[PDB]
Protein: Alternansucrase
Organism: Leuconostoc mesenteroides
Amino acid sequence: YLNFMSSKGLGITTTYTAATSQKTLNDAAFVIQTAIEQQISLKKSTEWLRDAIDSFVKTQANWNKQTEDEAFDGLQWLQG
Amino acid sequence: ENHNGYFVYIDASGKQVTGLQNIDGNLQYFDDNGYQVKGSFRDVNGKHIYFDSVTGKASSNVDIVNGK
């Protein structure tokens, strides 16, 4: 999440890992929150964020088909 | 030189070597204690460089970075 939002102009662009300390990630989450509230005031809308979150969510395997075991043999051929 | 199971490199100067180093045409790395890294990835500057498991020489590889 931090890396993805960073890439959209919301903070210092970051390579963060699960190995990064929890304290560091939480501090970085807040600087993104700050930047988010600024772009909400600047745009006077939250639709831009809805689309950013939706996009980010589909990036993650637990929240997309990679954890759904898509297969195409037999009638599975039609829709996966 | 080998100390505690690890390769160190001591210069013509007589100084222990850390960091990324091209020694005699081969690209290698040593951590803070001066030990050499093999079969692992290291981050120097903007580069993600793998080093070989036998030689510790920089060559191509695939890393699972985050989830991918």
Remarks:
- Chain A touches chain B through five residues (CB under 8 Å).
- Residues 25 and 32 of chain A are 10 Å apart (CA to CA).
- The longest helix of chain A spans residues 22-43.
